[PDB]
Design a protein around this ligand. Structure first.
Ligand SMILES: CC(=O)N[C@H]1CN[C@H](CO)[C@@H](O)[C@@H]1O
Length: 504
């Protein structure tokens, strides 16, 4: 048999017809079609009144999206007696084998029925439902001249990995609450279920800490390239968490330590050996900053930050970073990371950290390794300790240029086009581990505007999203590429300023 890899498309990027991404476990089409009309209602029914109330909220979220493009005023009804022309969302009789996020979605001429085990699975299934309707449905304004049809069809679905995440770096360049909510919303449509906020680095500190107010008054006032920076108040952070929760997305906040800490060091002189504030940094250098690993003030600082952040962050996890601590000795790093893990645990939070944080003698089997290095030896400690691993290989570093000539992006992991972002498996990155899942990382050294974020995340994130959701055996670039071409109008309709990748 003959095989080949993909080259660029001759003559440039290519960028009744559902466009489901990520690819579901099964999808069949039959004769006939459902028509969504102005008289449609969404019916919801759970196993008890509390569950029905949760489904009702999901129902309203769906109604809002459908109403924006159809111009209809679809409303939601708590009833298990859907009428012809209805969408029906239920958790009664879910197939347990599909787990918390899985669902069946069956469309007949008279009814759309989504059957899940949990409300979460109804929400994920609703992302597929939107992709079954014609392109145009994802517009934010009313679309005329499109019949709102869904083919008779049968879908069953569940994720391969539990953790399918996106990290946004808001330290290198700041992004507004609205901008962050938008990226969370867009990602949710592709079944991304985790959002990691990189809230602090050398160039800025982005979260209000009431006990150390100069973290904002001094530490938030810049970014890479000398823009004004910005920050989130605790109320704003809680708002982001709530917005994510409506999409069944867990928010994991990161305070990077002991490295990548210049903004803290520029805010409080007492965090430095000479007692003087560091000058703020607006360059892109890394590795030079460190907290004082053998001073008690360091641990008081970390405890105050963790106390305040834990109080406003419902996720059981806090990310404490641990990358590029090149101004911290191996011995001091081991000690520091163990000490801060104990603090986090005392506030009821489990610790996530970048490699090599798993090597800390203070780690527990409840700590999580975010494996970014993905070398043969990375996560040896994590594996021995039974720690879950989140993988972020080069293929998930979405801030890499698509190509040599990309106008934005970095290139220290090489180039990552839409094909490279697809053609990998988490088991490539680390062997013999408990792989919790995947996280796409969008560092922002070179991204200033929302358009920059869109360009780099779309279509790259779609590739990563499918790697997290769809089983390896059902992933195939030639298949995905053609599906992505079909999906393009939907990206346009969402107002995503995507890159028309010439490999698609
Ligand atoms: C975990 C991680 O990726 N840390 C840094 C790696 N080096 C990159 C280029 O300097 C930085 O963007 C990341 O912050």
């Amino acid at each position: 048999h003959h095989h080949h890899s993909s080259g660029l498309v001759p003559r440039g990027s290519h960028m009744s017809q559902p466009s489901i991404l990520p690819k579901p476990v099964s999808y069949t089409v039959g004769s006939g079609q459902f028509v969504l009309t102005k008289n449609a209602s969404i019916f919801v029914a759970g196993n008890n009144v509390g569950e029905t109330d949760e489904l009702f909220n999901i129902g309203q979220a769906l109604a809002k999206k459908l109403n924006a493009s159809t111009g209809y005023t679809i409303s939601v009804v708590k009833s298990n007696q859907p009428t012809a022309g209805s969408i029906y969302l239920t958790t009664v009789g879910g197939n347990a084998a599909l787990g918390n996020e899985g669902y069946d979605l069956i469309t007949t001429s008279n009814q759309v029925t989504l059957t899940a085990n949990k409300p979460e699975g109804v929400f994920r299934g609703n992302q597929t439902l939107l992709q079954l309707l014609p392109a145009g449905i994802e517009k934010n304004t009313v679309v005329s001249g499109v019949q709102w049809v869904i083919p008779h069809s049968n879908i069953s679905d569940k994720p391969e990995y539990e953790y399918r995440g996106l990290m946004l770096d808001v330290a290198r360049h700041f992004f507004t609450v609205d901008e962050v909510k938008r990226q969370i919303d867009l990602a949710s449509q592709y079944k991304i279920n985790k959002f990691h906020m990189h809230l602090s680095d050398d160039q800025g500190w982005r979260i209000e800490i009431k006990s150390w107010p100069d973290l904002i008054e001094i530490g938030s006032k810049g970014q890479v390239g000398g823009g004004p920076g910005g920050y989130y108040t605790q109320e704003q952070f809680k708002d982001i968490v709530s917005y994510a929760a409506e999409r069944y997305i867990e928010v994991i906040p990161e305070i990077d330590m002991p490295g990548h800490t210049n903004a803290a060091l520029a805010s409080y002189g007492e965090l430095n050996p000479d007692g003087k504030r560091k000058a703020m940094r607006t360059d892109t250098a890394v590795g030079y900053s460190t907290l004082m690993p053998r001073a008690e003030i360091t641990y008081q600082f970390v405890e105050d930050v963790i106390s305040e952040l834990a109080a406003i962050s419902p996720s059981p996890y806090i990310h404490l970073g641990g990358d590029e601590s090149n101004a911290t000795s191996a011995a001091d790093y081991d000690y520091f990371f163990g000490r801060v893990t104990a603090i986090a645990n005392s506030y009821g939070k489990k610790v996530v950290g970048w490699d090599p944080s798993d090597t800390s003698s203070g780690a527990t089997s409840d700590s999580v390794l975010q494996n970014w290095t993905c070398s043969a030896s990375t996560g040896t400690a994590a594996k021995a300790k039974g720690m879950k691993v989140i993988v972020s290989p080069a293929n998930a570093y979405l801030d890499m240029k698509y190509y040599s000539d990309s106008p934005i992006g970095l290139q220290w992991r090489g180039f990552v086009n839409t094909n490279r972002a697809y053609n990998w498996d988490p088991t490539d990155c680390i062997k013999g581990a408990n792989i919790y899942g995947v996280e796409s990382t969008l560092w922002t050294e070179t991204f200033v505007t929302q358009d920059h974020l869109d360009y780099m995340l779309y279509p790259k994130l779609l590739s990563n999203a499918e790697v997290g959701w769809t089983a390896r055996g059902d992933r195939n670039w030639d298949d995905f590429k053609e599906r992505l071409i079909e999906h393009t109008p939907r990206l346009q309709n969402k107002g995503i300023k995507f890159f028309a990748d010439p490999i698609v």
